Design an enzyme around this catalytic site. Structure first.
Site, mmCIF file in Angstrom:
data_model
loop_
_atom_site.group_PDB
_atom_site.id
_atom_site.type_symbol
_atom_site.label_atom_id
_atom_site.label_comp_id
_atom_site.label_asym_id
_atom_site.label_seq_id
_atom_site.Cartn_x
_atom_site.Cartn_y
_atom_site.Cartn_z
ATOM 1 N N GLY A 184 33.395 37.240 50.494
ATOM 2 C CA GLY A 184 32.881 36.798 49.203
ATOM 3 C C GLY A 184 32.342 35.380 49.278
ATOM 4 N N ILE A 240 33.993 30.757 44.131
ATOM 5 C CA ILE A 240 35.071 30.197 44.972
ATOM 6 C C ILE A 240 34.760 30.258 46.460
ATOM 7 N N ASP A 252 31.091 45.175 53.366
ATOM 8 C CA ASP A 252 31.313 45.675 52.026
ATOM 9 C C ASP A 252 32.702 46.318 52.028
ATOM 10 N N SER A 281 45.051 36.625 41.384
ATOM 11 C CA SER A 281 44.561 36.362 40.039
ATOM 12 C C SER A 281 45.719 36.189 39.060
ATOM 13 N N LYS A 316 43.846 43.980 40.784
ATOM 14 C CA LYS A 316 44.399 42.871 41.539
ATOM 15 C C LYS A 316 45.917 42.949 41.594
ATOM 16 N N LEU A 338 42.152 29.907 35.329
ATOM 17 C CA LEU A 338 40.716 29.836 35.127
ATOM 18 C C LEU A 338 40.193 28.716 35.980
ATOM 19 N N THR A 369 33.385 32.085 30.760
ATOM 20 C CA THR A 369 34.599 32.032 29.923
ATOM 21 C C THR A 369 34.935 30.605 29.520
ATOM 22 N N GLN A 393 45.005 28.322 30.933
ATOM 23 C CA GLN A 393 45.491 27.635 32.111
ATOM 24 C C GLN A 393 44.259 27.414 32.983
HETATM 25 N N1 LIG Z 1 36.961 32.172 38.915
HETATM 26 C C1 LIG Z 1 38.169 32.388 38.407
HETATM 27 O O1 LIG Z 1 38.592 31.878 37.178
HETATM 28 C C2 LIG Z 1 39.198 33.194 39.132
HETATM 29 C C3 LIG Z 1 40.514 33.030 38.726
HETATM 30 C C4 LIG Z 1 41.516 33.705 39.391
HETATM 31 C C5 LIG Z 1 41.200 34.530 40.456
HETATM 32 N N2 LIG Z 1 39.912 34.692 40.854
HETATM 33 C C6 LIG Z 1 39.614 35.588 41.974
HETATM 34 O O2 LIG Z 1 38.774 34.847 42.819
HETATM 35 C C7 LIG Z 1 37.897 35.646 43.517
HETATM 36 C C8 LIG Z 1 36.541 34.935 43.467
HETATM 37 O O3 LIG Z 1 35.955 35.114 42.207
HETATM 38 P P1 LIG Z 1 34.723 34.191 41.811
HETATM 39 O O4 LIG Z 1 34.948 33.767 40.399
HETATM 40 O O5 LIG Z 1 34.280 33.279 42.883
HETATM 41 O O6 LIG Z 1 33.688 35.432 41.621
HETATM 42 P P2 LIG Z 1 32.112 35.547 42.033
HETATM 43 O O7 LIG Z 1 31.485 34.213 42.041
HETATM 44 O O8 LIG Z 1 31.716 36.628 41.156
HETATM 45 O O9 LIG Z 1 32.314 35.988 43.561
HETATM 46 C C9 LIG Z 1 32.802 37.277 43.829
HETATM 47 C C10 LIG Z 1 32.444 37.733 45.237
HETATM 48 O O10 LIG Z 1 32.870 39.069 45.369
HETATM 49 C C11 LIG Z 1 31.914 39.664 46.212
HETATM 50 N N3 LIG Z 1 31.942 41.124 46.144
HETATM 51 C C12 LIG Z 1 31.776 41.886 45.029
HETATM 52 N N4 LIG Z 1 31.826 43.178 45.371
HETATM 53 C C13 LIG Z 1 32.053 43.242 46.687
HETATM 54 C C14 LIG Z 1 32.193 44.342 47.517
HETATM 55 N N5 LIG Z 1 32.138 45.575 47.016
HETATM 56 N N6 LIG Z 1 32.400 44.099 48.848
HETATM 57 C C15 LIG Z 1 32.436 42.809 49.330
HETATM 58 N N7 LIG Z 1 32.304 41.729 48.495
HETATM 59 C C16 LIG Z 1 32.108 41.954 47.189
HETATM 60 C C17 LIG Z 1 30.587 39.124 45.732
HETATM 61 O O11 LIG Z 1 29.692 39.178 46.804
HETATM 62 P P3 LIG Z 1 28.168 39.668 46.742
HETATM 63 O O12 LIG Z 1 27.812 39.706 45.293
HETATM 64 O O13 LIG Z 1 27.504 38.716 47.727
HETATM 65 O O14 LIG Z 1 28.218 41.019 47.402
HETATM 66 C C18 LIG Z 1 30.940 37.685 45.465
HETATM 67 O O15 LIG Z 1 30.710 36.935 46.633
HETATM 68 C C19 LIG Z 1 38.084 37.041 42.910
HETATM 69 O O16 LIG Z 1 38.943 37.767 43.770
HETATM 70 C C20 LIG Z 1 38.834 36.847 41.618
HETATM 71 O O17 LIG Z 1 39.717 37.889 41.237
HETATM 72 C C21 LIG Z 1 38.895 34.033 40.202
HETATM 73 O O1 LIG Z 2 34.480 38.635 33.285
HETATM 74 C C1 LIG Z 2 35.740 38.624 33.239
HETATM 75 C C2 LIG Z 2 36.459 38.730 34.423
HETATM 76 O O2 LIG Z 2 35.660 38.825 35.514
HETATM 77 C C3 LIG Z 2 37.869 38.701 34.424
HETATM 78 C C4 LIG Z 2 38.803 38.784 35.594
HETATM 79 C C5 LIG Z 2 40.212 38.651 35.426
HETATM 80 C C6 LIG Z 2 41.079 38.725 36.532
HETATM 81 O O3 LIG Z 2 42.443 38.610 36.528
HETATM 82 C C7 LIG Z 2 40.542 38.923 37.773
HETATM 83 O O4 LIG Z 2 41.442 38.975 38.770
HETATM 84 C C8 LIG Z 2 39.177 39.050 37.951
HETATM 85 O O5 LIG Z 2 38.647 39.247 39.176
HETATM 86 C C9 LIG Z 2 38.295 38.988 36.866
HETATM 87 O O6 LIG Z 2 38.509 38.560 33.217
HETATM 88 C C10 LIG Z 2 37.854 38.472 32.013
HETATM 89 C C11 LIG Z 2 38.610 38.367 30.852
HETATM 90 C C12 LIG Z 2 37.981 38.266 29.615
HETATM 91 O O7 LIG Z 2 38.783 38.148 28.528
HETATM 92 C C13 LIG Z 2 36.594 38.279 29.514
HETATM 93 C C14 LIG Z 2 35.820 38.396 30.675
HETATM 94 O O8 LIG Z 2 34.458 38.396 30.547
HETATM 95 C C15 LIG Z 2 36.460 38.494 31.937
HETATM 96 O O1 LIG Z 3 40.078 35.961 37.861
HETATM 97 C C1 LIG Z 3 40.175 35.576 36.671
HETATM 98 C C2 LIG Z 3 41.407 35.299 36.066
HETATM 99 O O2 LIG Z 3 42.558 35.444 36.743
HETATM 100 C C3 LIG Z 3 41.470 34.897 34.742
HETATM 101 C C4 LIG Z 3 42.736 34.581 34.027
HETATM 102 C C5 LIG Z 3 42.975 33.261 33.656
HETATM 103 C C6 LIG Z 3 44.149 32.945 32.982
HETATM 104 O O3 LIG Z 3 44.375 31.662 32.642
HETATM 105 C C7 LIG Z 3 45.090 33.929 32.676
HETATM 106 O O4 LIG Z 3 46.241 33.659 32.008
HETATM 107 C C8 LIG Z 3 44.843 35.242 33.031
HETATM 108 O O5 LIG Z 3 45.765 36.193 32.729
HETATM 109 C C9 LIG Z 3 43.664 35.575 33.715
HETATM 110 O O6 LIG Z 3 40.326 34.770 34.000
HETATM 111 C C10 LIG Z 3 39.081 35.028 34.512
HETATM 112 C C11 LIG Z 3 37.975 34.871 33.674
HETATM 113 C C12 LIG Z 3 36.722 35.115 34.213
HETATM 114 O O7 LIG Z 3 35.638 34.974 33.428
HETATM 115 C C13 LIG Z 3 36.566 35.536 35.534
HETATM 116 C C14 LIG Z 3 37.660 35.676 36.376
HETATM 117 O O8 LIG Z 3 37.467 36.064 37.680
HETATM 118 C C15 LIG Z 3 38.936 35.425 35.850
#
Ligand SMILES: NC(=O)c1ccc[n+]([C@@H]2O[C@H](COP(=O)([O-])OP(=O)(O)OC[C@H]3O[C@@H](n4cnc5c(N)ncnc54)[C@H](OP(=O)(O)O)[C@@H]3O)[C@@H](O)[C@H]2O)c1
Ligand SMILES: O=c1c(O)c(-c2cc(O)c(O)c(O)c2)oc2cc(O)cc(O)c12
Ligand SMILES: O=c1c(O)c(-c2cc(O)c(O)c(O)c2)oc2cc(O)cc(O)c12
EC number: 1.1.1.219
Length: 320
Positions: free
Chosen positions: A7, A12, A59, A119, A158, A183, A199, A218
């Site tokens: 990714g 991230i 993939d 997550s 997740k 977040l 968000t 958070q």
């Molecule tokens: N941002 C947050 O608030 C947050 C919080 C907690 C946890 N996370 C976790 O952090 C990770 C990163 O999220 P991000 O916010 O950086 O999301 P992002 O910018 O949407 O990046 C997600 C990545 O997933 C890849 N991906 C999607 N489908 C795939 C597939 N089928 N095979 C291989 N790669 C694939 C995409 O790659 P391509 O599009 O290049 O294929 C992209 O590089 C996720 O696991 C999410 O659950 C994010």
């Molecule tokens: O777009 C969204 C999203 O991607 C995720 C999300 C939450 C997780 O815990 C993950 O692990 C993760 O990969 C994605 O939450 C959301 C929650 C909302 O209320 C509204 C949203 O639009 C998203």
């Molecule tokens: O991965 C994601 C994630 O974990 C959360 C999240 C944040 C919190 O602070 C929580 O309490 C919770 O339950 C989920 O939000 C998201 C919102 C997005 O738009 C996209 C994401 O990928 C996440």
């Protein structure tokens, strides 16, 4: 040493690659489509990318596809996650992908540690909210399935993937760490809008459908998070799941931080169903800090870095 980051095209992932490159690792960045200029340009523009970054098409849906990328790696950072029938289009792929990458790690014989980005959705999705969450806490799958809130399938995907992965990790002496961000908010290197910034800046853009996640929010700064990732890879004392979260506050407090910083935007004063008696839910990062890790940024830093990057890229208007 050589580390893989899945990714790498993401919010991230690309920031982590950047940091791993700056720290002097050799990085194998994986992407589904290496011909996508709008995602690989930003990777190939990072410092030391010419000499220390290679690109790898993989993939999560394709069994074995991470095999070659991981072979010869000392570390893997599994950040990628799949994004009409969620049970099969999102849930199963995520679990299988996850297992797929530990299988690929074992098949590699050289991986000393696998770090999975989990997550907050694995920790606090239940009907009643505790005042403080820690790493012993897990989300309530039956509440996810029965209520189907926004993103339920990502909560469920997740949670199930991380649990399935812990099974496997103990079985096969695979040394596994998990990091749980809340977040993630900050500046970014991509030219698309980070999903979690859709968000976070919802108070500004008025995207109601994103308020629920920040009603009791958070937060963690993207750079603190990537550092935490690398720290936990390196620090050999590291064990278990680690929450990575630096701030918590309810939406009123967030919106109020923003109004003061950004008079320029139409940031509302009150939100539906939110008393000032609403308690904030904290995600405790004590386990992480007790190891020694320290957070370098503040809620204000996060949202400044975010809003500045977003306007610079024309993703946010400069005022309303
Ligand atoms: N941002 C947050 O608030 C947050 C919080 C907690 C946890 N996370 C976790 O952090 C990770 C990163 O999220 P991000 O916010 O950086 O999301 P992002 O910018 O949407 O990046 C997600 C990545 O997933 C890849 N991906 C999607 N489908 C795939 C597939 N089928 N095979 C291989 N790669 C694939 C995409 O790659 P391509 O599009 O290049 O294929 C992209 O590089 C996720 O696991 C999410 O659950 C994010
Ligand atoms: O777009 C969204 C999203 O991607 C995720 C999300 C939450 C997780 O815990 C993950 O692990 C993760 O990969 C994605 O939450 C959301 C929650 C909302 O209320 C509204 C949203 O639009 C998203
Ligand atoms: O991965 C994601 C994630 O974990 C959360 C999240 C944040 C919190 O602070 C929580 O309490 C919770 O339950 C989920 O939000 C998201 C919102 C997005 O738009 C996209 C994401 O990928 C996440």
């Amino acid at each position: 040493e050589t580390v893989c980051v899945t990714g790498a095209s993401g919010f991230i992932g690309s920031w982590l690659v950047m940091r791993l490159l700056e720290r002097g690792y050799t990085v194998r960045a994986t992407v589904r489509d290496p011909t996508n200029v709008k995602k690989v340009k930003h990777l190939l523009d990072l410092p030391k990318a010419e000499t220390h970054l290679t690109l790898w098409k993989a993939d999560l849906a394709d069994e074995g596809s991470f095999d070659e990328a991981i072979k010869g790696c000392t570390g893997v950072f599994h950040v990628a996650t799949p994004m009409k029938d969620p049970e099969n289009e999102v849930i199963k792929p995520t679990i299988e992908g996850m297992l797929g990458i530990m299988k690929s790690c074992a098949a590699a014989k050289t991986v000393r540690r696998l770090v999975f980005t989990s997550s907050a959705g694995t920790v606090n999705i239940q009907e009643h909210q505790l005042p403080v969450y820690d790493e012993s806490c897990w989300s309530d799958m039956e509440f996810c399935r029965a209520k189907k809130m926004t993103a339920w399938m990502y909560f469920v995907s997740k949670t199930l993937a991380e649990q399935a992965a812990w099974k496997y990790a103990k079985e096969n002496n695979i040394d596994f760490i998990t990091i749980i961000p809340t977040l993630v908010v900050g500046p970014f290197i991509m030219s698309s809008m980070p999903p979690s910034l859709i968000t976070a800046l919802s108070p500004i853009t008025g995207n109601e459908a994103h308020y629920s996640i920040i009603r009791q929010g958070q937060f963690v700064h993207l750079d603190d998070l990537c550092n935490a990732h690398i720290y936990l890879f390196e620090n050999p004392k590291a064990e278990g799941r680690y929450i990575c979260s630096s701030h918590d506050c309810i939406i009123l407090d967030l919106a109020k931080m923003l109004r003061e910083k950004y008079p320029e935007y139409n940031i509302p004063t009150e939100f539906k169903g939110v008393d000032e008696n609403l308690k904030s839910v904290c995600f405790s990062s004590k386990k992480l800090t007790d190891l020694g890790f320290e957070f370098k940024y503040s809620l204000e830093d996060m949202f400044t870095g975010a809003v500045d990057t977003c306007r610079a890229k024309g993703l946010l208007p400069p005022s309303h």
